[PDB]
Design a protein around this ligand. Structure first.
Ligand SMILES: O=C(NS(=O)(=O)c1ccc(NCC2CCOCC2)c([N+](=O)[O-])c1)c1ccc(N2CCC3(CC2)CC(N2CCC[C@H]2c2ccccc2C2CC2)C3)cc1Oc1cnc2[nH]ccc2c1
Length: 150
């Protein structure tokens, strides 16, 4: 699976469900990966429900600006992974990136979406890929958290 594609499709779906058409994502949508994208969306929606009130507070705490957005992303993701990697923290990472993109559009800072997608792709490639592959890959994520009987 292509980790950039996972990031792009996740962000694009999250934005499109708010009525924002992200052109980079529009061209991504035009090109069993679908089960991975779907399962990640479902897991992220479940995470955001479990943490709904904390997410509302975070949206108030992001303090997004063009010149500090990268540092906000860096601070949050470093703290999220301080105790190591697992599937739930990977889902949290995706949902956080999605919140950052939604907030960027809502605050008239839409260019940041492209930057956030890059930061997420690079973070996944540099920090999360070894763990993912050592733990059965995205196929193992789907087996654990997809539609199969638990
Ligand atoms: O359980 C965890 N990890 S797991 O591997 O066992 C597992 C369990 C279940 C699932 N799936 C079940 C779905 C499948 C679909 O069908 C329906 C059932 C999955 N997964 O799908 O991968 C994996 C787990 C790890 C860490 C964590 N943490 C929450 C608090 C923080 C640490 C991590 C602290 C908080 N930060 C503090 C400051 C900033 C804030 C922050 C940072 C980043 C993002 C958000 C936030 C704020 C909270 C909002 C994040 C919470 C966890 O709990 C959940 C509970 N349910 C979840 N559901 C989907 C993910 C999920 C995670």
């Amino acid at each position: 699976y292509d980790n950039r594609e996972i990031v792009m499709k996740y962000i694009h779906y999250k934005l499109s469900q708010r009525g924002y058409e992200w052109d980079a994502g529009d061209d991504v949508e035009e090109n069993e990966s679908e089960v991975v994208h779907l399962t990640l969306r479902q897991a992220g929606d479940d995470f955001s429900r479990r943490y709904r009130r904390d997410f509302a507070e975070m949206s108030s705490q992001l303090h997004l600006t063009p010149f500090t957005a990268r540092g906000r992303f860096a601070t949050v993701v470093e703290e999220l992974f301080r105790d190591g990697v697992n599937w739930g923290r990977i889902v949290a990472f995706f949902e956080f990136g999605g919140v950052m993109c939604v907030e960027s559009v809502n605050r008239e800072m839409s260019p940041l979406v492209d930057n956030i997608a890059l930061w997420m792709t690079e973070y996944l490639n540099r920090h999360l890929h070894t763990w993912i592959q050592d733990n059965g890959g995205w196929d193992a994520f789907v087996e654990l958290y997809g539609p199969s009987m638990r």
